[PDB]
Amino acid sequence: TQSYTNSFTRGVYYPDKVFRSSVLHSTHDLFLPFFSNVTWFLPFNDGVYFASTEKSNIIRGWIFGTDSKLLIVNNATNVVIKVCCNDPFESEFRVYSSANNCTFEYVSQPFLMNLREFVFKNIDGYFKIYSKHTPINLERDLPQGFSALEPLVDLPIGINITRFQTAYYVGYLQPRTFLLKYNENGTITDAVDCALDPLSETKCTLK
Amino acid sequence: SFTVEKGIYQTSNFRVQPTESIVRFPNITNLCPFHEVFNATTFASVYAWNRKRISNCVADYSVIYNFAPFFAFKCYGVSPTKLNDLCFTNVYADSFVIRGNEVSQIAPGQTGNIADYNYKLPDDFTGCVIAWNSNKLDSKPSGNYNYLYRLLRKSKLKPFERDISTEIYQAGNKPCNGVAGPNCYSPLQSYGFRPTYGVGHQPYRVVVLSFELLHAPATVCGPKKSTNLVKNKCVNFNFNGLTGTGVLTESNKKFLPFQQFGRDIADTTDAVRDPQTLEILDITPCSFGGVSVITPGTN
Amino acid sequence: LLRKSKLKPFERDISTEIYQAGNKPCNGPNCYSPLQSYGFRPTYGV
């Protein structure tokens, strides 16, 4: 299915691990634009905005990668990911048909603990993920408001992770310029896109 | 000038100097396992010298000194005093057990029986060589026979090659199949070990470290140690990888559990979290100012 | 290749007794001695 909806003012992650208070900061690099086309369900483009509702979601699957040669298992036990044809679906099965070196094993606890939002990015020398979970307010559409996106994992090795497969929403990201606001305690509460309407561009210029 | 008039002149500037030095790091993890090869129950034979490679780990070399007064510690190339700087590309540790006065044969350039037919070592190798006595662990008063060495074989071994090939030596001019008998011998003679043996015949355990370089990955493998800390004192601090000079003071901030750096409106560092322990400290620059000399007329 | 600390520019040293303090004069552990043997006589090429 290729159903479409509104992305709204969601999808902003922390540019860097720096603590600030009661200041505004202008940041470059890839972000998710406000009011974009999000596919309500693939060369991975530049980033992934996987925002599956999955209210209960006991276990679904977190297949990632790019000929029996990056798989992620989100079970309640340890994740255990490795860098290495099966298409799965008491046990799991249906996935132990391709085997390889499968090294770079780490992680201890599942990513899943509503609405879960995960942004995935890949740079020439790193694979970064960012995650956030928010309670639902009993509504189908995305909630109105703003929320942060903490960083979780930065895998040192990775080049061109392309293929992925888990109602969910999929959105892509492009380089942009944003203006973020830091509250008194040090968490992001508001953001402004500098290239949406002339008023926001004026706001970005005036800081 | 040699004369001055009435007035106040801004002459110089004054400041305080740091006293101590502070370095910190997020301890160590993924330590290279030197201990597992330095303390076991078996050590294998001579010609069947075990080979192992380890990489992608941090190195300590502190376990080396936690042993007996090593019989020999002649290390070529790198010096034990300066515990290297590079991570080379790969490292190998070879361990076995030999007999006393044969430890001299383990050398860059030499000749004999152990270093000629059993374990050949090239001159261009630098590495390090360690050997220590183990007479109290692998010598029973009934005759040890679990250690064997090769003593009859042609074609002296090329550097760094192992030949586990038991055959029947053809010393003579007749065909030889199965039983050696006359004009025919069998290599791999045993050792024998007793606790009352004289010095120079007692067993010795030998470990040789050989590492190679010139490749790209694994540049530097340092311990990245750390020291203590001080409060309320103008000092130079090197928390994690960020350096600075000033006075530290515990801060009542609200650092989120994924960030360590701290900034302000004017883009200056004013809050850093400790690498090892979890504590946030504000930074204040050391006192400084200007000096003015109020001087009346020099006349 | 061992003289401790660092060498000053345009300095020549003609002393060779021992390196480190060492256990006793130490004429095994410690007292590793300087001037590693320098044999270029084997032809390894250029």
Ligand SMILES: *[C@@H]1O[C@H](CO)[C@@H](O)[C@H](O)[C@H]1NC(C)=O
């Ligand atoms: C965004 O997605 C496609 C653009 O190709 C379009 O069908 C859709 O109407 C657009 N707008 C929204 C709100 O989905």
Ligand SMILES: *[C@@H]1O[C@H](CO)[C@@H](O)[C@H](O)[C@H]1NC(C)=O
């Ligand atoms: C969870 O997934 C990991 C990844 O393969 C696996 O090693 C582990 O056995 C799984 N645990 C359970 C309870 O299925």
Ligand SMILES: *[C@@H]1O[C@H](CO)[C@@H](O)[C@H](O)[C@H]1NC(C)=O
């Ligand atoms: C292990 O897996 C691949 C594919 O089987 C193999 O070619 C290679 O040696 C290993 N891959 C990595 C990334 O080390």
Ligand SMILES: *[C@@H]1O[C@H](CO)[C@@H](O)[C@H](O)[C@H]1NC(C)=O
């Ligand atoms: C990774 O995949 C992309 C296509 O998605 C390709 O252009 C690139 O060459 C690949 N990387 C390497 C090292 O071949």
Ligand SMILES: *[C@@H]1O[C@H](CO)[C@@H](O)[C@H](O)[C@H]1NC(C)=O
């Ligand atoms: C900051 O944290 C303190 C901790 O007690 C809290 O009382 C205060 O409401 C917080 N301020 C915010 C979240 O703006």
Ligand SMILES: *[C@@H]1O[C@H](CO)[C@@H](O)[C@H](O)[C@H]1NC(C)=O
């Ligand atoms: C050496 O023997 C075993 C094997 O490594 C080890 O567990 C033990 O702690 C060591 N003993 C001493 C005295 O170091």
Ligand SMILES: *[C@@H]1O[C@H](CO)[C@@H](O)[C@H](O)[C@H]1NC(C)=O
């Ligand atoms: C590093 O190890 C020290 C030694 O136990 C510990 O006190 C410190 O908390 C550790 N730091 C970490 C795990 O970040």
